[PDB]
Amino acid sequence: PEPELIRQSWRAVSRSPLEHGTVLFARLFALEPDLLPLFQYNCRQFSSPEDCLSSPEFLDHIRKVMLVIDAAVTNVEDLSSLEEYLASLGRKHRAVGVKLSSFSTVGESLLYMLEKSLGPAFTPATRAAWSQLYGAVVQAMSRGW
Ligand code: HEM
Numbered sequence: 001p002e003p004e005l006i007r008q009s010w011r012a013v014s015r016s017p018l019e020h021g022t023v024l025f026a027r028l029f030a031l032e033p034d035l036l037p038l039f040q041y042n043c044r045q046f047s048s049p050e051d052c053l054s055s056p057e058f059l060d061h062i063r064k065v066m067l068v069i070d071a072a073v074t075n076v077e078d079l080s081s082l083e084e085y086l087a088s089l090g091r092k093h094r095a096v097g098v099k100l101s102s103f104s105t106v107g108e109s110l111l112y113m114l115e116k117s118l119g120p121a122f123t124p125a126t127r128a129a130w131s132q133l134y135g136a137v138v139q140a141m142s143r144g145w
Contacts, residue, residue, distance in 0.1 A: 090144020
């Protein structure tokens with residue numbers, strides 16, 4: 001994927017990862033509402049939809065998602081450095097009940113969050129680069145299923 005387009009489009013979002021990751025998750029739950037109970041059942045401190053989603057565990061996972069995307073961005077020129085990490089990350093999600101299909105919905109949610117932050121700066125070339133980068137991340141995780 002075009003590295004300069006990826007790095008530049010990620011800069012501002014990367015500086016406020018919880019705010020932007022929260023936008024991503026809201027879109028994800030809109031597209032795939034069955035993910036909400038999956039998080040709820042995996043939550044340990046609280047039990048309710050709302051208490052789980054505002055919990056440190058859930059906020060931690062938002063940061064983890066953004067950490068992984070940041071790892072893909074900073075390794076865009078050679079994602080081979082994340083192949084084993086991502087295969088294992090896929091195996092881990094499969095074990096907690098996540099479907100591989102849900103990661104395509106995450107991609108749609110990522111693109112939505114970037115377009116919301118960047119507005120007209122999110123060009124079709126920038127979209128294509130992200131689709132290719134995130135697709136490569138999902139391809140590497142798909143080894144886990
Ligand atoms: C599809 C929606 C997703 C759901 C429902 C979900 C749910 C979970 C759950 C329940 C865990 C705990 C796993 C465990 O205790 O072993 C987890 C771990 C994790 N998730 Fe996700 N996740 C999702 C998407 C993502 C994405 C897209 C990323 C990264 C881009 C990500 C990054 C992580 C990381 C880094 C961990 C910690 C893995 C570890 O324990 O080694 N998640 N996720």
